Each structure stands twice: as C-alpha cells, then as structure tokens.
Amino acid sequence: DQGGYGFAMRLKRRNWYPGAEESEVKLNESDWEATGLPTKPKELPKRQKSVIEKVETDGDSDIYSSPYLTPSNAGNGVNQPKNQATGHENFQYVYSGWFYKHAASEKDFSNKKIKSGDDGYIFYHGEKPSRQLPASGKVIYKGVWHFVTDTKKGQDFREIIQPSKKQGDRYSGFSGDGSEEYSNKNESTLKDDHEGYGFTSNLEVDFGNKKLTGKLIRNNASLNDKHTTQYYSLDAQITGNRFNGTATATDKKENETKLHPFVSDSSSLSGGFFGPQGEELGFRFLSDDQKVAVVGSAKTKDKSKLTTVLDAVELTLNDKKIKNLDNFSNAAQLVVDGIMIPLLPEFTRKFEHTPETKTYEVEVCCSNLNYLKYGMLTRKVEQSMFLQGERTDEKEIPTDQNVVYRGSWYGHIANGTSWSGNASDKEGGNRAEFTVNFADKKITGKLTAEQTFTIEGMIQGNGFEGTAKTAESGFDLPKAYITDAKVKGGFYGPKAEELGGWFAYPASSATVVFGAKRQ
Amino acid sequence: DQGGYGFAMRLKRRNWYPGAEESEVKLNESDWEATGLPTKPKELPKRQKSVIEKVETDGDSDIYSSPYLTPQPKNQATGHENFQYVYSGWFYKHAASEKDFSNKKIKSGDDGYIFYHGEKPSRQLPASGKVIYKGVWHFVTDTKKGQDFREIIQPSKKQGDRYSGFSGDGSEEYSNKNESTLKDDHEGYGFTSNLEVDFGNKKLTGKLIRNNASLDKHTTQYYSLDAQITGNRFNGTATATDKKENETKLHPFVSDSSSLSGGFFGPQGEELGFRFLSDDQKVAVVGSAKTKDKKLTTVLDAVELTLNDKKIKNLDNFSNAAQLVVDGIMIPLLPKEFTRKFEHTPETKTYEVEVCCSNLNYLKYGMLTRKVEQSMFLQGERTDEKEIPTDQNVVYRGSWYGHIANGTSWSGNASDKEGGNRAEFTVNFADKKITGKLTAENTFTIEGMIQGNGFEGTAKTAESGFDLDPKAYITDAKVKGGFYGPKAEELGGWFAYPGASSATVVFGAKRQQP
Ligand code: NA
C-alpha cells in the first residue's frame, strides 16, 4: 500500500433524530487514520487517544481498552478478560487492539442530531519496520484481530454481540463491546482445540515464496465438539517489508440470514513486518461491501539466515555518523523523525516540507531512478545525506559477468577546508561509473569530481561492500586525502537495474552517497 | 357552574421519543386548575406562576406574559381596556426539552398557562337593559403528531404537534397585535371578545374574533357564544363559526363547546370572566370583558357577623347557597339530619361550621369559627324581583341562631324542636309588608317593607328587657334580609346591635302551603 506505522478506524454512531435519520452509515477507506510512530507500542496511539479523551461522558468517564494494553493516563470493573494466541503473546514491536468510552448521547435537537452508543477506535501500530527478513522457510505467526462494523437501522449481529443496546444499528458493532459475550475471553481454562482467548489470528508466512496465508477465528465460550469459529481466510504477496492481498469471508453462504458482519470478501488486505527480522506483523482490511473493518497483529512463537530487503540510511555531516532510517519498502517515501516525506511531486530535484524541527529541506536524485533515491537532507540547523532503496531479491541477482552502471553522487570531504559537490548528469560535475561481475561476485567503479574516488568491493547476496580512495595525489579544496574508506551499498529493483552505496570517513574526513543505473 | 375566582389550563407537550411516542395528547375538563383569589388581578395567578418558576430552562429563563399583565404588542378591545376586577391572559417559558432517553421520554416546546381570575364576584347587577361588554380571549390546543394550525400560528416549531398551539406563541403572527394603528373595522388589537349582556332577560350572546394584520375586511370570527345568567354566574355554549366543510381546517376552532361558564365581578358586575373546553377536546379558551371604560338588583346575600365585635362583613359568593366562601377558600355545606355540624381544613388552621337547615335549598345559615374566632353567617340566592309572588298572606316557619347579652351572654343554636329557637313570619307581598317573631323561651318583633327581592325593617325586644337565661333592652335595630329560591319559598335576614345589651342574630324560614 502506501506505508505507515499504523492505522486506526473510529466507531460510527448513526443519527436517529426522527425525520432526519440516517438509515445507515457505511465504513470508507477514507475513514482510516494514521497513528504515527508509537514510543511504546503497548500504549494507545496518541492522536486517537486525545480525540477519545475529549469525547464527553455523563456517568462513566473511563477509557476501556484491550486487556494487554497499557491503561496509562482509564480504569475497569469485573475485569480479567484475555485476548491472546497461546504461545504467541509477548509482543514487543507491534500492538493491535481497541479502546473506547461509554460516550454520552449527542442530544442536539436544534441541529436535528441524536446519536448514542460507545465511541472509540480499533487500531494497530508498530515500531521498527523491518529491513531484514528470514531468507527462506515457512513460519507460523499467531496473534489477535479486532473489528468495527457499519451501522444500519434494524441491523443486528446477535451471533457476535448480544443486541440489547442496538449494537450494529445505533453504533458500530466492535470486538470490545461489553456484549461480546460468545467468545471464551472470560474463561479460566482452554479447550484442547482452542487457539487461545477471544478473537485470534493464525498466519503462515512463506519467506521462500514471498507469500502468506492465514485464518481469523473466534475462540468460543464453553457454555462436544469444536470450540472455534472461522470468519476469514487471508492471502497476500510479500514485497519487501510489506504485504498486500485479500481476505475471504469464510461463511457468506448465499441464502443468509447472516447473524454476523463477516459476509463479504476484502480486496484491501495490507500490512507489514516489524522488528529486527520481521518477527512481528500488523495488518488491516476493509470489506468490499463496506460493512466491516479489521485490524490485527501476529508474532512468531514466544521465546536462521536473513536477507536484507532495503537500505535506508542518514549520514550526518557534522559528526560523519551513519544512522539507519525507517522505511516501508518504498524508495520514494522518505521517513524521518516519524513523519513521511514524499520524493515525487528535471534531473535531481529540490524542495522543502513542513508536517501538520520546523521544516525539512531535501535535495533528491534522481529522475531516472525508481527503486533508489539519494541526496541531501537538512533540518531547521542540521545537515545530512541520505540514501534508500528497495533491494532486489537475492534469487533475482543476474549472473552477467560484465555490467556497467552510470550515475552520480553527493560528496562532502575535507582535510582542511571543506569540499561539497551535489550530484548531476553533467558535465564535469559529479559522475559515477561501475562495472559489476556478478558471476565473480566482484564489483568496482570510480567517482570523479573532475579529483576522484575509486571504489572496489565484493558482492554478498544483494549488497556489496568495499573501499574508496582519493588519488592522493589529493582532492580539491588545497587537498584532501582518503584511504581505505569504509564502503557499503546494495543492488535495487528487479534483476538489479540499479545500485547505490555510501561511505563515511572516518586530518581528512568524508561522507558520500552514490547511485548508478544499469545500461 | 361549580364556582370559583378563576381557572387556568396548562400547555401540553407530547412525548416524541421514538418507539414510545404519544400520537396525541387531548385536553380534559380535569385539566382545569383553580387559581384562587388574586390580591392583584393584574398579576399572574400565584399557584400556576410557582409551577412555571420551577420549570427548567436552558438559555432563556424569562417568563413571558400578556402585555397588559404585571411582569410592544397590544391585546385589547378599544374603549374597553381598563380592567380592575378581572384579568385573563397567558404566561410561559421557552422551556428546556425533556431528554430522558432511558425512560423513553422526549418533550420539547413552550410550557405555560392560559388563565382568567377575578376579585369581588358581584352581589348586584343592573336590573334591566342590554349592555355591551368587550375584552380579550385566549386559547391553548391539544397536541397531535402531524397536526399544525398554520392559519393562526406559523408552524416552524411544530406548534400544535410537539407542544400546544396557544395565543401567546412567538409565531402567532397573523393578528394586528404589533401594528401601530387600527383599521376602521378592527375592534382592537389581537384576539378580542364582544358580548351583549341582556340583564332584563338574564341572558347573553357574543363573538370571539381575531383582528387581522394588514398587509377587504380586517377581522375573523371564530366563535359565537350563548349563555343563561343565574345570579352572578352564566352557563351555556360556544359555537364554532367555521367548523369543517369545504376546508381541511387550518385552525383549531372547529368544534362547538357545551361547557361555557363564567361569572360577573365588581360592584355591579361591570366586568366578567369565562372559559370553555371544545367538545372534541382540541381547544380550551379563557377570556374577560368589561363595560366601556369611564337601577340595580341584588342577586345574593352572603354575610358574616362577628361576635366579639358584633360587626357584619360581606362574604364573597358565586351564587351558590351551599358553597361557603371565606378567606378565599371554598367550603361545601352538603356532604357528597336537621342543621348539621363539621370541620374542614384546606390543602387559620381549621374551620368549624354549624349550618342550617336540611330543608333549605337556596339559603344556608349558622355558626363559623376559625382557629379562636367566632361568627355567624348567612347566604342565599335571591329570587328574581320579577318572580316575587303577589300573595297577600304567606306564612314562613323555621329557626335562628342567637347571641345576646346585657350582662351574661345567652347563646342558642337553631332547631326544629322543641321550645328551642323558633321563627315565624307572615308576609303580605301585595302590601310590601313583612312581620314575624323569634322566640327562645316563649322574643323579637320585626316589621319591614319589601323592596324588590329584599326587605328592610326593625327588630325590638319590646317591653321591657328580655331575659338572659337582668333585662336586655333592644329597640329600633336595623334588620336586612331577602327572599331566596325561585318564587320566594325561603326567606332570610340578620341584625346587629348596636349600629348595656348587645345582639347578633341570623334567621331563616321556609314557606308553607294550603
Ligand atoms: Na503512521
């Protein structure tokens, strides 16, 4: 999809003012809200929490939330419910769940509006979207899932929520409702075929084939023979640290009458992997009939060769240091300080951006690159270089023994006075060239200002590493000297049409990002 | 009717909670509320005012009322605006909505009352002639879902549907009440009344109209009225002038009423108040009217004779001998067996009353005590002067209550027996002459002239002293009285002395027959 740390969807409340009544309020893709990056995934997402904090109540002011979440800033009663897939409960990077208030009714006759029922959100959010994943093998992920429905006059979902308060009619059915009383979430022990407590998810992720399948079920209250009910299966393709696909409603029958909301397929399943090697994931979807939205989370068993799916780095000038950036496997979306900066609105480019550090100044290259972006980033005053690209699958690395790549680079170097040079297509300005022997796992090339650097390295999988050096001789602006500069890079896009890398040093310094295109 | 100083009727608000909705709330005779005696007729009636004071608001706490009432529209019949005894009108609040969702009650709209009240209900009226009364009238309707009265009230706020149509509504915008001058054929401003009272024939007729805003005849008539006068009261019907024929009826005045009732107030009934409820229970009306701004007959006697100070006060009465009105409260004299005795506490602590007699129907008299004060009382409904019989020899027999003393006091209740208090009278109507005797122990002698339905003369202990079981010498004591009931079957009088022996006496006798 379009990437992000998380998504939230608000409960609906239907207007029943007589004469001005909405017979229905459907859910919409436009209803999804970004959560932003959480400092602590176990806490509620801050933007949406603030909204609910301001929601008026009249008798019970508490915020109720999923049992494994941090009550934080909020209270409860008659409470020890559980919602967990057994053996898969120790989430560290990703949380999904719900939170809500018993909101006061809106009783605004003078605006012909009457609304009543809970107000709240379902959501998932995560930190540390993954830059590496297992290289191969099928891996079981389990966790939880949550839902919120549309509202329609006369509608009920009595199979999942006892409809004494018009759940599904006046306000959304949702998995946190006080009348969701048919799961085993309050029971003290499990039946031998339960996957856990409440609504749980089970996914099989095939890292070898870049795809996944799964099942979303309810673990049923024991009030012979089977004690779970399946509402969806899932199917998705993995691209980098993201996945996209479909959800299939398990019981839609034909003839109905359909006492639950899970009756339509979804063509908008999307999620992503989080953690050092994608050991946790978050996902969401919206049903095609706009009657239900789902979010969820899953993880490998509570306590392997890896492949790198992306590079995203920031090189800070002042201290020549190199930090990893978050990225959602999208070279054209620059993620810094938890905000997303697009990189496409003519070689290179330049612009500034302010969200909602004051503003970000970015110079990005290049116009002919599609899986790789690099340039200059400045906060306001801080200055850095950056590079980010989507690695080519190691199994797609071409075998060709002679391959030339051409492009440019941004440079900042000094043994005394400093030299800085942007990237360019012309003329004697920064230019880069590389010859790669894939068969040999060998790579070499040169960067020239017009004087030059010379790079050499070997090829490990879908990335390379080596060293860069001035002529020394020396450089320009009066001379700078570089020797044994630590060089890191990778190949980007299908069959490695693109490649790029960077180096920092380490009385001469140096920080360089470069990217080249295949001929 | 059943008499009173005034009546009020509250606006209705209809429950429109979905699923627990009232489709309609009709008016009912039982909805009428007594107002009590006002100290100042220009002020709002106190009981109902207190109710409205407690009505909850949320944004506008004011009480709005008819412009001539004591807190630039006008509501008045020109030349007939200076009311002193009787006021009718309305008052209300922009009441907050009731929004009780868990008990399934939603109500919205104005809350308030229409009312009339008066002081000094009349004991005399003009003896004859037709007299024009004009004034104002007011209405409140039922509520019914989907109902509007757009001819009278612009229905932007569901007037007639969620809360009663009423003449004080802010959207009553079709009368001339806000205009600065009058058309040639307007009777005045807003909704006005015009009555012709025929005191000669004891009846009245009238018309209730709206004076229309000018933006072709300028008034619209909604009712005519017809009533019979009995004493200081009147009862009859209202006839809806436009009912239902070729029209779908854009106003609430579509049904007749068989419950028009009202009464006269002031020294000679120069003002009146009235009310009615439509037979279809869709609309209640109250109103008031007066003779133009600036010989009598007496229709009732109602007096209190205070012992301690031998003084005699007029009581209010609504032309009903069996309803004793003291201190603004109504005390019935027949239990819904000669003489009677009982006590009564309203809502002075309690009233103790001894009343006579069981055979009298237009005349009641006896003892009244407050708690401690003690008085005698007499009240009766005079016979029409034109019904005074011409018979030259007529005997009346009965009793009397007596309290007298030149030294020690003598008190004697009334009775049928035996040597106890007894009264006898012979009346020569042809001669306009009356005489009779009261005896305790076998004594007062009374001569008097008849005038209309009343008499006036003297009572003397004669010669000399009386008993005191010490001689009490009362002579030339003024005696006043009347003939009560149709054709003067019952008669009554009283006397106070002086105008070392005192005396206060009420008596009543009944007519005999060959
Ligand atoms: Na986000």
What's the DSSP call for residue B157? Answer: G
Give B-chain residues touching A16 at CB under 8 angstroms: 18
**Do B404 and B503 belong together in one domain?**
yes
**Do B76 and B137 belong together in one domain?**
no
- What residues of chain A have any CB closer than 8 angstroms to a CB in chain B? 16, 18, 105, 107, 109, 116
Distances (CA, A) of B74 to A433, B111, B192, B435: 98, 22, 11, 57
The CB-side HSE value for B311 (13 A sphere, CA atoms) comes to: 6
Residue among A105, A109, A116 whose CB faces B97 most closely: A109
**Do B113 and B134 belong together in one domain?**
no
CA–centroid distance, A34 to ligand 1, in Å, is: 5
Give B-chain residues touching A107 at CB under 8 angstroms: 97, 99, 101
Residue among B16, B18, B99 whose CB faces A107 most closely: B99
Q: Are A169 and A151 in contact (CB under 8 A)?
A: yes
Return d(Cα B320, Cα B342) in angstroms, integer.
Answer: 19
Closest CA in chain B for residue A105 = B101
The CATH code of the domain that includes B61 is: 2.40.128.250
Residue among B18, B99, B108 whose CB faces A16 most closely: B18
Q: Are B338 and B298 in contact (CB under 8 A)?
A: no
Distances (CA, A) of A217 to A8, A9, A199, A233, A254: 21, 21, 6, 9, 21
**Do B87 and B35 belong together in one domain?**
yes
Distances (CA, A) of B436 to B365, B395, B433, B479: 18, 9, 11, 12
Return d(Cα B365, Cα A109) in angstroms, integer.
Answer: 60
Q: Which domain holds residue B273?
A: 122-295
**Do B260 and B136 belong together in one domain?**
yes
Cα B461 vs. chain centroid, distance in angstroms?
39
**Side chain identity, residue B208:** L
Strand B373-381: give its sheet, edge to edge: B311-314, B300-306, B373-381, B363-370, B351-356, B341-344
**Do A155 and A300 belong together in one domain?**
yes
Distances (CA, A) of B386 to B201, B202, B452: 11, 11, 8
- HEC string of A168-234? CCCECCECCCCCCCCECCCCCCCCCCCCEECEEEEEEEECCCCEEEEEEEEEECCCCCCCEEEEEEE
What resolution in angstroms, rounded to 1 decimal?
2.1
Residue among B97, B101, B108 whose CB faces A105 most closely: B101
Among left, alpha and beta (phi > 0; psi -120 to 50; other), residue B114 is beta
Return d(Cα B461, Cα B503) in angstroms, integer.
Answer: 10
Cα A381 vs. chain centroid, distance in angstroms?
29
Q: How far is A116 from chain B (nearest CA, A)?
A: 10
**Do B279 and B134 belong together in one domain?**
yes
> Tokens 């969807």 label which residue?
A9
Contacting residues for B39 by C-beta, under 8 A, at least 6 apart: none
Most B CBs within 10 A among A22, A109, A111, A165, hence the mutation to make, goes to A109
**Do B103 and B193 belong together in one domain?**
no
Helix (H) or strand (E) holding B234: strand B233-240
The CATH code of the domain that includes A453 is: 2.40.160.90
Return d(Cα A321, Cα A318) in angstroms, integer.
Answer: 8
Q: How far is B158 from chain A (nearest CA, A)?
A: 13
CB contact under 8 A, B108 and A109: yes
Helices (H) and strands (E) in chain A, counts: 1, 38
CA–centroid distance, A46 to ligand 1, in Å, is: 11
CA–centroid distance, A125 to ligand 1, in Å, is: 8
Most B CBs within 10 A among A58, A106, A114, A116, hence the mutation to make, goes to A114
**Do A120 and A147 belong together in one domain?**
no
**Do A202 and A230 belong together in one domain?**
yes
Give A-chain residues touching B18 at CB under 8 angstroms: 16, 18
What's the DSSP call for residue B275? Answer: E
CB contact under 8 A, B97 and A105: no
**Do B94 and B146 belong together in one domain?**
no
Most A CBs within 10 A among B99, B157, B163, hence the mutation to make, goes to B99
Q: Are A374 and A515 in contact (CB under 8 A)?
A: yes
- What residues of chain B have any CB closer than 8 angstroms to a CB in chain A? 16, 18, 97, 99, 101, 108
Q: Are B254 and B243 in contact (CB under 8 A)?
A: yes
Neighbour-count burial for A382-409, b at 16+ CB within 10 Å, e otherwise:
ebbbbbbbbbbbbeebbeeeebebebbb
**Do A297 and A418 belong together in one domain?**
no
Strand residues in B278-320 grouped as ranges (E):
283-290, 296-298, 300-306, 311-314
Q: Are A17 and A282 in contact (CB under 8 A)?
A: no
- Across chain B, which distance is largest between two alpha carbons, in Å? 87
- Beta-carbon count within 10 A of A500 CB: 30
**What are residue A241's phi and psi, to 5 degrees?**
-95, 15
Closest CA in chain A for residue B98 = A107
Most B CBs within 10 A among A14, A16, A21, A107, hence the mutation to make, goes to A107
